[PDB]
Design a protein around this ligand. Structure first.
Ligand code: HEM
Ligand code: HEM
Ligand code: HEM
Ligand code: HEM
Lengths: 141, 146, 141, 146
């Protein structure tokens, strides 16, 4: 579970993301594609070339969802229900891939927020991404 | 593989007693039921709405036999699983878009099916050698992903 | 989330284990130690040889805790509080390992309860061990 | 170790700018903070109760520098990691009893640390080369477990 501290941390670090969320979302994806090529199997229909608008488009949607979980940090299961449904029933992404994206999102944030990416914040963001992943995977079986 | 002659012998000898037809259908069907999300690749097979419906689906059973077949033949090239599954590795990547994690889910189901089937015969030392083979197969099959 | 069918299936299966749970506990550990030798890192103080009384006893302990879990299938978090504490603050076993014991336990039930280890029962027990693992690692951070 | 020459040059160029003393302390400290369970190996290190207590503990800093020291040497034998890390693998197994999953956790933390430090210079493709490398090292460290 996320502690008050964690919650503060996440709102704070994400606060700083502001308007770059979209771009950071696109970048996390590209990093993921390059470091874990197996994740590509889920996007056979995408142009995964560098600067692909499909990826930009997708990075933004991922970023809006993360942004929505932060706004509803106290009711994530309900704020993300729909996306939980989609992932369980339609996309059926294997669970191990959430940790990969989580990881690439952390690298991205670290690469952009040197001042905020403190040990304490890193830990909070990691627990958060893990909780988001847990919600998205909750209805799998 | 990093199999011991002793380990090689154990694999080899239990296999000898396997009905690939039956074990292939059961391993694949169990997969579709335990880890429902692997069904994403078999929509064209029909209704997999229930254990019964999965376990009963002939398309499933027949795919299961094709899979254990290939696996079976891999057991004859235990010293170069890489070269035996190269083309199958490309295919899975390039044509089917199967996430290699699936290869590991199946392997573990395979091991539960063998235990199920051989009871007493499937001893700790025998499972141990089988675990190494299933990991080895999965790695070989995933080897050509890019 | 364990469905009613699931809770039923589990209680049935476990119902047949009966006086043998301890032996199954012991057998699962042995299968874990051989198949996943890295798990041995947590028991340097044990005699991990075949038929060790240290392993047999530990086997019983584990077995018993599962029993208690089946019994309070409706209130796991609560029935296993102490155990979640112990694992998170003292043992600190890495989470990956829970999946390995869970698997050696399926294999063991499968090998001993042929008729009962149906595809639907298999799916249930799996979710169950999954749930149990979640509970034991919930207080890690 | 599928490090393309271009991947190896990239690993090597960036490693050129690292302060192993510094990075070592941050990586280690950060691990004890993000995955507190890993603290199990260091109860003789004293106070790890808070992030500041961990990050600043002289013992964590000194140990981190040791670890990265060994890692750095590793980077000069990218060709023979298993060989390079053999006595260390034995030690972690037989004397220290360190679950190898620990090696992968540290690799990921390390990658975030490099991202933290190099900002924009830690490009998608540089990260992918380092991913292969942390993985190679963890595997080499786990090779002698039994
Ligand atoms: C916390 C992590 C994740 C979040 C927040 C997230 C969120 C989303 C959202 C908002 C969408 C678009 C739904 C729509 O069309 O409105 C989406 C689609 C999708 N996601 Fe997830 N996702 C996550 C993890 C993953 C992972 C790990 C993968 C696979 C590696 C994945 C694969 C997909 C795919 C294939 C689609 C559909 C894309 C399309 O066809 O346009 N997702 N996700
Ligand atoms: C033990 C590991 C596996 C082996 C040896 C294997 C082998 C095979 C073989 C020999 C084929 C025949 C296709 C051809 O030659 O055109 C095939 C097809 C296929 N496999 Fe795999 N497979 C394995 C695991 C999996 C898993 C775990 C999945 C998904 C859960 C999967 C999904 C498929 C699909 C969707 C096809 C195409 C079937 C069709 O054409 O309808 N495979 N596989
Ligand atoms: C299926 C989930 C598990 C359950 C229900 C479970 C249950 C238990 C129980 C009941 C005890 C004994 C408590 C006592 O001594 O009063 C225990 C101790 C212990 N468990 Fe867990 N355990 C599980 C998973 C694991 C795993 C996967 C590992 C590591 C591979 C592990 C490592 C240990 C260790 C090292 C001890 C202490 C042994 C000793 O010194 O006696 N446990 N566990
Ligand atoms: C890149 C991976 C790692 C490398 C290259 C590495 C290297 C080293 C070296 C060079 C030593 C000192 C050897 C000696 O005392 O003779 C050491 C000791 C040690 N390592 Fe590792 N290490 C790694 C990962 C880890 C991790 C992830 C952990 C724990 C989670 C760990 C736990 C320990 C402990 C507890 C000691 C002994 C400390 C003491 O003196 O009390 N190591 N390691």
């Amino acid at each position: 579970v996320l502690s008050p501290a964690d919650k503060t941390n996440v709102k704070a670090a994400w606060g700083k993301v502001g308007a770059h969320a979209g771009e950071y979302g696109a970048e996390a994806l590209e990093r993921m594609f390059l470091s874990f090529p197996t994740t590509k199997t889920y996007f056979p229909h995408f142009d995964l070339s560098h600067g692909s608008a499909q990826v930009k488009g997708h990075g933004k949607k991922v970023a809006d969802a993360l942004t929505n979980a932060v706004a509803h940090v106290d009711d994530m299961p309900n704020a993300l229900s729909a996306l939980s449904d989609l992932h369980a029933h339609k996309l059926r992404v294997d669970p191990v891939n959430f940790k990969l994206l989580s990881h690439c999102l952390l690298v991205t944030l670290a690469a952009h927020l040197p001042a905020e990416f403190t040990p304490a914040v890193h830990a909070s963001l990691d627990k958060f991404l893990a909780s988001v992943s847990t919600v998205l995977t909750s209805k799998y079986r | 593989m990093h199999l011991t002659p002793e380990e090689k012998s154990a694999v080899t000898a239990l296999w000898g007693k396997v009905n690939v037809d039956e074990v292939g259908g059961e391993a694949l069907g169990r997969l579709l039921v335990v880890a429902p999300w692997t069904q994403r690749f078999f929509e064209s097979f029909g209704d997999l709405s229930t254990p019964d419906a999965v376990m009963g689906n002939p398309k499933v059973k027949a795919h299961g036999k094709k899979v254990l077949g290939a696996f079976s033949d891999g057991l004859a090239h235990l010293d170069n699983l890489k070269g035996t599954f190269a083309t199958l590795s490309e295919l899975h990547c390039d044509k089917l878009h199967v996430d290699p994690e699936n290869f590991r889910l199946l392997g573990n189901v395979l091991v539960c099916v063998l235990a199920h089937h051989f009871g007493k015969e499937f001893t700790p030392p025998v499972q141990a050698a089988y675990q190494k083979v299933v990991a080895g197969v999965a790695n070989a099959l995933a080897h050509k992903y890019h």
